[PDB]
Amino acid sequence: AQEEEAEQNLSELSGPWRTVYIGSTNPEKIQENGPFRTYFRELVFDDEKGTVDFYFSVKRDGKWKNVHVKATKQDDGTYVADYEGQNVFKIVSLSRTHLVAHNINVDKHGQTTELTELFVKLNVEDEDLEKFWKLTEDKGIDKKNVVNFLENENHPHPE
Amino acid sequence: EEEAEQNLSELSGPWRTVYIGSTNPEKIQENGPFRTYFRELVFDDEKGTVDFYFSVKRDGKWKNVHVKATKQDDGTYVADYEGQNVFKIVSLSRTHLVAHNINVDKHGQTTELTELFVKLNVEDEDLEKFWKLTEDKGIDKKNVVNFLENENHPH
Numbered sequence: 081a082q083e084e085e086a087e088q089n090l091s092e093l094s095g096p097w098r099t100v101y102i103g104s105t106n107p108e109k110i111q112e113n114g115p116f117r118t119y120f121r122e123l124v125f126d127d128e129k130g131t132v133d134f135y136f137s138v139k140r141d142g143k144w145k146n147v148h149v150k151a152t153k154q155d156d157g158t159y160v161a162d163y164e165g166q167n168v169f170k171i172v173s174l175s176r177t178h179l180v181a182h183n184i185n186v187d188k189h190g191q192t193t194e195l196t197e198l199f200v201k202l203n204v205e206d207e208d209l210e211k212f213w214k215l216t217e218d219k220g221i222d223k224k225n226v227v228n229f230l231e232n233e234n235h236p237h238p239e
Numbered sequence: 240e241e242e243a244e245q246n247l248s249e250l251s252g253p254w255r256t257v258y259i260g261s262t263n264p265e266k267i268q269e270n271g272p273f274r275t276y277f278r279e280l281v282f283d284d285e286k287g288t289v290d291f292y293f294s295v296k297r298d299g300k301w302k303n304v305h306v307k308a309t310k311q312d313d314g315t316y317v318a319d320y321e322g323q324n325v326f327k328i329v330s331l332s333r334t335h336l337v338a339h340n341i342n343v344d345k346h347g348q349t350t351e352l353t354e355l356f357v358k359l360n361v362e363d364e365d366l367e368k369f370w371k372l373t374e375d376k377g378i379d380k381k382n383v384v385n386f387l388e389n390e391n392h393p394h
Protein backbone atom coordinates (compact mmCIF):
# COMPACT_ATOMS: atom_id res chain seq x y z
CA ALA A 81 0.00 0.00 0.00
CA GLN A 82 0.80 3.72 0.09
CA GLU A 83 -0.06 6.52 2.48
CA GLU A 84 -3.57 7.15 3.81
CA GLU A 85 -5.90 10.14 3.19
CA ALA A 86 -4.69 13.33 4.86
CA GLU A 87 -7.05 15.00 7.37
CA GLN A 88 -7.69 18.62 6.47
CA ASN A 89 -9.27 21.64 8.13
CA LEU A 90 -7.59 24.63 6.50
CA SER A 91 -10.78 26.64 6.09
CA GLU A 92 -10.03 28.11 9.50
CA LEU A 93 -6.73 29.54 8.21
CA SER A 94 -8.41 31.82 5.63
CA GLY A 95 -7.95 35.54 6.04
CA PRO A 96 -5.30 38.26 5.60
CA TRP A 97 -1.75 37.00 5.01
CA ARG A 98 1.49 38.77 4.20
CA THR A 99 4.74 37.89 2.46
CA VAL A 100 7.80 37.79 4.69
CA TYR A 101 10.44 36.13 2.48
CA ILE A 102 10.55 34.60 -0.97
CA GLY A 103 13.64 32.84 -2.29
CA SER A 104 14.38 31.78 -5.87
CA THR A 105 16.82 29.62 -7.83
CA ASN A 106 16.47 32.31 -10.50
CA PRO A 107 16.86 35.84 -9.02
CA GLU A 108 15.34 37.46 -12.11
CA LYS A 109 11.90 36.13 -11.11
CA ILE A 110 11.88 37.93 -7.74
CA GLN A 111 13.95 41.03 -8.51
CA GLU A 112 12.22 44.31 -9.21
CA ASN A 113 9.47 43.89 -11.83
CA GLY A 114 9.82 40.15 -11.39
CA PRO A 115 6.67 38.02 -11.84
CA PHE A 116 7.01 36.38 -8.42
CA ARG A 117 7.82 39.46 -6.32
CA THR A 118 4.40 38.99 -4.77
CA TYR A 119 3.01 40.95 -1.84
CA PHE A 120 0.23 38.69 -0.50
CA ARG A 121 -2.96 40.21 0.90
CA GLU A 122 -5.37 37.33 1.45
CA LEU A 123 -5.65 33.52 1.25
CA VAL A 124 -8.92 31.60 1.24
CA PHE A 125 -8.94 27.82 1.82
CA ASP A 126 -11.95 25.73 0.77
CA ASP A 127 -11.92 22.19 2.16
CA GLU A 128 -14.92 21.05 0.10
CA LYS A 129 -13.70 21.97 -3.36
CA GLY A 130 -10.17 21.40 -2.10
CA THR A 131 -8.81 24.69 -3.42
CA VAL A 132 -6.87 27.77 -2.30
CA ASP A 133 -7.39 31.25 -3.68
CA PHE A 134 -4.43 33.66 -3.69
CA TYR A 135 -5.02 37.41 -3.69
CA PHE A 136 -1.83 39.38 -4.10
CA SER A 137 -0.19 42.39 -5.68
CA VAL A 138 2.71 42.59 -8.12
CA LYS A 139 4.28 45.56 -9.88
CA ARG A 140 4.46 44.96 -13.64
CA ASP A 141 5.71 47.39 -16.27
CA GLY A 142 5.75 50.15 -13.66
CA LYS A 143 2.11 49.57 -12.69
CA TRP A 144 0.61 47.80 -9.68
CA LYS A 145 -1.58 44.79 -10.34
CA ASN A 146 -3.94 42.93 -7.99
CA VAL A 147 -3.90 39.28 -8.96
CA HIS A 148 -6.29 36.48 -8.06
CA VAL A 149 -5.07 32.92 -8.62
CA LYS A 150 -6.93 29.68 -7.82
CA ALA A 151 -4.99 26.55 -6.91
CA THR A 152 -6.35 23.00 -6.96
CA LYS A 153 -5.22 20.20 -4.68
CA GLN A 154 -4.22 16.80 -6.01
CA ASP A 155 -4.25 13.22 -4.71
CA ASP A 156 -0.54 13.90 -4.54
CA GLY A 157 -1.18 16.51 -1.87
CA THR A 158 0.40 19.29 -3.90
CA TYR A 159 -1.57 22.04 -5.59
CA VAL A 160 -1.56 23.14 -9.21
CA ALA A 161 -2.14 26.65 -10.50
CA ASP A 162 -1.63 28.79 -13.59
CA TYR A 163 0.38 31.97 -13.13
CA GLU A 164 3.29 32.96 -15.39
CA GLY A 165 3.43 29.32 -16.51
CA GLN A 166 2.39 26.18 -14.66
CA ASN A 167 2.95 25.86 -10.92
CA VAL A 168 3.18 22.91 -8.53
CA PHE A 169 2.97 24.24 -5.03
CA LYS A 170 3.65 22.31 -1.78
CA ILE A 171 2.89 23.36 1.79
CA VAL A 172 5.89 22.26 3.81
CA SER A 173 4.87 23.83 7.16
CA LEU A 174 1.57 25.35 8.28
CA SER A 175 -0.20 26.68 11.41
CA ARG A 176 -2.64 29.40 12.56
CA THR A 177 0.26 31.85 12.23
CA HIS A 178 2.71 30.84 9.48
CA LEU A 179 3.03 29.12 6.13
CA VAL A 180 6.27 27.80 4.67
CA ALA A 181 5.82 26.72 1.08
CA HIS A 182 7.79 25.48 -1.92
CA ASN A 183 6.74 26.24 -5.49
CA ILE A 184 8.00 24.86 -8.82
CA ASN A 185 7.34 27.07 -11.83
CA VAL A 186 7.92 26.30 -15.48
CA ASP A 187 7.55 29.42 -17.60
CA LYS A 188 6.48 29.58 -21.27
CA HIS A 189 10.03 28.83 -22.37
CA GLY A 190 10.16 25.63 -20.31
CA GLN A 191 12.45 27.27 -17.76
CA THR A 192 12.15 25.65 -14.35
CA THR A 193 12.29 27.88 -11.28
CA GLU A 194 12.04 26.67 -7.69
CA LEU A 195 10.85 29.17 -5.09
CA THR A 196 10.58 28.98 -1.30
CA GLU A 197 8.41 31.27 0.78
CA LEU A 198 7.41 32.28 4.26
CA PHE A 199 4.08 34.02 4.82
CA VAL A 200 2.47 35.10 8.09
CA LYS A 201 -1.16 35.56 9.04
CA LEU A 202 -2.61 38.75 10.42
CA ASN A 203 -4.80 37.42 13.22
CA VAL A 204 -7.60 39.53 14.61
CA GLU A 205 -9.12 37.92 17.70
CA ASP A 206 -12.76 38.33 18.62
CA GLU A 207 -11.91 39.45 22.16
CA ASP A 208 -9.83 42.34 20.85
CA LEU A 209 -12.45 43.30 18.25
CA GLU A 210 -15.05 43.54 21.01
CA LYS A 211 -12.77 45.73 23.14
CA PHE A 212 -12.42 48.08 20.13
CA TRP A 213 -16.12 48.27 19.37
CA LYS A 214 -17.04 48.84 23.01
CA LEU A 215 -14.41 51.57 23.35
CA THR A 216 -15.58 53.03 20.06
CA GLU A 217 -19.18 53.00 21.32
CA ASP A 218 -18.25 54.65 24.66
CA LYS A 219 -16.65 57.55 22.74
CA GLY A 220 -19.89 58.01 20.82
CA ILE A 221 -18.35 57.14 17.45
CA ASP A 222 -20.76 56.00 14.70
CA LYS A 223 -20.00 52.60 13.11
CA LYS A 224 -20.10 54.55 9.87
CA ASN A 225 -17.19 56.69 10.99
CA VAL A 226 -14.89 53.70 11.27
CA VAL A 227 -12.46 52.76 8.52
CA ASN A 228 -11.20 49.27 7.68
CA PHE A 229 -7.49 49.36 6.79
CA LEU A 230 -7.18 45.60 6.29
CA GLU A 231 -9.40 45.48 3.22
CA ASN A 232 -8.85 48.82 1.51
CA GLU A 233 -7.56 49.34 -2.04
CA ASN A 234 -6.18 52.80 -1.17
CA HIS A 235 -2.99 51.46 0.52
CA PRO A 236 0.75 52.42 0.45
CA HIS A 237 3.19 50.99 -2.09
CA PRO A 238 6.13 48.90 -0.83
CA GLU A 239 8.05 49.85 -3.99
CA GLU B 240 8.06 23.98 23.62
CA GLU B 241 9.32 27.45 24.60
CA GLU B 242 8.27 31.11 24.48
CA ALA B 243 10.37 34.27 24.62
CA GLU B 244 10.29 36.20 27.89
CA GLN B 245 7.56 38.87 27.89
CA ASN B 246 8.90 42.44 27.79
CA LEU B 247 7.58 45.81 26.51
CA SER B 248 10.54 46.19 24.19
CA GLU B 249 9.61 42.70 23.00
CA LEU B 250 6.43 44.25 21.61
CA SER B 251 8.50 46.46 19.29
CA GLY B 252 8.38 45.47 15.62
CA PRO B 253 6.05 45.53 12.58
CA TRP B 254 2.45 46.61 13.37
CA ARG B 255 -0.54 47.15 11.07
CA THR B 256 -3.67 49.27 11.39
CA VAL B 257 -6.90 47.28 11.41
CA TYR B 258 -9.56 49.88 12.30
CA ILE B 259 -9.56 53.57 13.20
CA GLY B 260 -12.68 55.41 14.34
CA SER B 261 -13.15 59.20 14.60
CA THR B 262 -15.73 61.57 16.11
CA ASN B 263 -14.82 63.87 13.20
CA PRO B 264 -15.10 61.93 9.89
CA GLU B 265 -12.99 64.45 7.94
CA LYS B 266 -9.93 63.50 10.01
CA ILE B 267 -9.90 59.91 8.66
CA GLN B 268 -11.30 60.42 5.16
CA GLU B 269 -8.95 60.37 2.16
CA ASN B 270 -6.27 63.07 2.62
CA GLY B 271 -7.10 63.15 6.33
CA PRO B 272 -4.14 63.32 8.76
CA PHE B 273 -5.34 60.32 10.79
CA ARG B 274 -5.97 57.80 8.01
CA THR B 275 -2.69 56.24 9.17
CA TYR B 276 -1.26 52.96 7.90
CA PHE B 277 1.10 51.74 10.64
CA ARG B 278 4.49 50.26 9.76
CA GLU B 279 6.37 49.77 13.05
CA LEU B 280 6.14 50.62 16.72
CA VAL B 281 9.15 50.81 19.02
CA PHE B 282 8.59 50.72 22.79
CA ASP B 283 11.29 51.83 25.20
CA ASP B 284 10.82 50.93 28.89
CA GLU B 285 13.74 52.86 30.34
CA LYS B 286 12.90 56.11 28.51
CA GLY B 287 9.11 55.83 28.69
CA THR B 288 8.61 56.45 24.99
CA VAL B 289 6.90 54.93 22.00
CA ASP B 290 8.09 55.65 18.47
CA PHE B 291 5.43 55.52 15.75
CA TYR B 292 6.26 54.76 12.11
CA PHE B 293 3.35 55.11 9.68
CA SER B 294 2.31 56.34 6.24
CA VAL B 295 -0.45 58.78 5.35
CA LYS B 296 -1.66 60.17 2.02
CA ARG B 297 -1.57 63.94 1.67
CA ASP B 298 -2.24 65.85 -1.53
CA GLY B 299 -2.38 62.61 -3.50
CA LYS B 300 1.03 61.56 -2.19
CA TRP B 301 2.09 59.01 0.40
CA LYS B 302 4.29 60.32 3.17
CA ASN B 303 6.28 58.31 5.71
CA VAL B 304 5.96 59.86 9.15
CA HIS B 305 7.74 59.34 12.49
CA VAL B 306 6.22 60.46 15.79
CA LYS B 307 7.73 60.05 19.24
CA ALA B 308 5.29 59.89 22.15
CA THR B 309 6.37 60.35 25.77
CA LYS B 310 4.71 58.70 28.75
CA GLN B 311 3.28 60.73 31.64
CA ASP B 312 2.92 59.78 35.33
CA ASP B 313 -0.74 58.91 34.79
CA GLY B 314 0.47 56.38 32.21
CA THR B 315 -0.86 58.23 29.16
CA TYR B 316 1.34 59.47 26.34
CA VAL B 317 1.73 62.86 24.74
CA ALA B 318 2.70 63.43 21.12
CA ASP B 319 2.98 66.31 18.69
CA TYR B 320 1.29 65.50 15.39
CA GLU B 321 -1.22 67.75 13.64
CA GLY B 322 -1.75 69.53 16.96
CA GLN B 323 -1.32 68.07 20.45
CA ASN B 324 -2.33 64.48 21.24
CA VAL B 325 -2.98 62.56 24.47
CA PHE B 326 -2.69 58.87 23.67
CA LYS B 327 -4.07 56.15 25.96
CA ILE B 328 -3.43 52.41 25.65
CA VAL B 329 -6.68 50.58 26.48
CA SER B 330 -5.49 46.98 25.89
CA LEU B 331 -2.03 45.74 24.90
CA SER B 332 -0.57 42.30 24.31
CA ARG B 333 1.94 40.49 22.12
CA THR B 334 -0.60 40.50 19.29
CA HIS B 335 -2.87 43.52 19.58
CA LEU B 336 -3.15 47.15 20.66
CA VAL B 337 -6.39 49.06 21.30
CA ALA B 338 -5.90 52.77 21.88
CA HIS B 339 -7.80 55.97 22.49
CA ASN B 340 -6.37 59.28 21.23
CA ILE B 341 -7.58 62.79 21.89
CA ASN B 342 -6.33 65.38 19.39
CA VAL B 343 -6.65 69.15 19.53
CA ASP B 344 -5.64 70.87 16.28
CA LYS B 345 -4.07 74.25 15.60
CA HIS B 346 -7.57 75.80 15.75
CA GLY B 347 -8.76 74.47 19.12
CA GLN B 348 -10.91 71.74 17.52
CA THR B 349 -11.04 68.48 19.49
CA THR B 350 -11.32 65.05 17.81
CA GLU B 351 -11.48 61.74 19.65
CA LEU B 352 -10.13 58.66 17.88
CA THR B 353 -10.09 54.94 18.61
CA GLU B 354 -7.93 52.33 16.94
CA LEU B 355 -7.19 48.64 16.70
CA PHE B 356 -3.71 47.62 15.58
CA VAL B 357 -2.20 44.19 15.21
CA LYS B 358 1.39 42.99 15.33
CA LEU B 359 2.97 40.87 12.63
CA ASN B 360 4.86 38.18 14.54
CA VAL B 361 7.58 36.10 13.00
CA GLU B 362 8.60 33.17 15.19
CA ASP B 363 12.18 31.93 15.35
CA GLU B 364 11.29 28.30 14.59
CA ASP B 365 9.37 29.37 11.53
CA LEU B 366 12.31 31.36 10.21
CA GLU B 367 14.55 28.32 10.66
CA LYS B 368 12.14 26.09 8.75
CA PHE B 369 12.14 28.62 5.89
CA TRP B 370 15.94 28.83 5.81
CA LYS B 371 16.38 25.04 6.01
CA LEU B 372 13.95 24.61 3.13
CA THR B 373 15.71 27.35 1.17
CA GLU B 374 19.08 25.70 1.51
CA ASP B 375 17.67 22.26 0.73
CA LYS B 376 16.74 23.68 -2.67
CA GLY B 377 20.20 25.13 -3.15
CA ILE B 378 19.01 28.74 -3.12
CA ASP B 379 21.73 31.29 -2.36
CA LYS B 380 20.94 33.62 0.57
CA LYS B 381 21.45 36.62 -1.68
CA ASN B 382 18.66 35.28 -3.88
CA VAL B 383 16.14 35.91 -1.10
CA VAL B 384 14.01 39.03 -0.75
CA ASN B 385 12.70 40.47 2.50
CA PHE B 386 9.18 41.69 1.70
CA LEU B 387 8.45 42.65 5.28
CA GLU B 388 11.16 45.27 5.42
CA ASN B 389 10.05 46.70 2.06
CA GLU B 390 6.47 47.14 3.31
CA ASN B 391 7.85 48.61 6.59
CA HIS B 392 9.93 51.16 4.64
CA PRO B 393 7.81 52.05 1.57
CA HIS B 394 8.03 55.23 -0.54
Ligand SMILES: O=C(c1ccccc1)c1ccccc1
Nearest residue numbers: 118163167181183195196197
Ligand atom coordinates in the same frame (compact mmCIF):
# COMPACT_ATOMS: atom_id res chain seq x y z
O1 LIG C 1 4.06 33.84 -4.86
C1 LIG C 1 3.89 32.45 -5.03
C2 LIG C 1 2.82 31.98 -5.99
C3 LIG C 1 2.05 32.96 -6.67
C4 LIG C 1 1.04 32.60 -7.59
C5 LIG C 1 0.77 31.21 -7.86
C6 LIG C 1 1.52 30.21 -7.20
C7 LIG C 1 2.54 30.60 -6.27
C8 LIG C 1 4.83 31.59 -4.19
C9 LIG C 1 6.19 31.96 -4.03
C10 LIG C 1 7.06 31.17 -3.26
C11 LIG C 1 6.59 30.02 -2.63
C12 LIG C 1 5.23 29.63 -2.78
C13 LIG C 1 4.37 30.42 -3.55
Ligand SMILES: O=C(c1ccccc1)c1ccccc1
Nearest residue numbers: 275318324338339340353354
Ligand atom coordinates in the same frame (compact mmCIF):
# COMPACT_ATOMS: atom_id res chain seq x y z
O1 LIG D 1 -3.28 58.00 14.37
C1 LIG D 1 -3.12 57.89 15.78
C2 LIG D 1 -1.97 58.69 16.37
C3 LIG D 1 -0.75 58.85 15.67
C4 LIG D 1 0.30 59.61 16.23
C5 LIG D 1 0.16 60.21 17.50
C6 LIG D 1 -1.05 60.06 18.21
C7 LIG D 1 -2.09 59.31 17.64
C8 LIG D 1 -4.12 57.00 16.53
C9 LIG D 1 -5.15 56.36 15.78
C10 LIG D 1 -6.11 55.53 16.39
C11 LIG D 1 -6.06 55.33 17.81
C12 LIG D 1 -5.06 55.95 18.60
C13 LIG D 1 -4.10 56.78 17.95
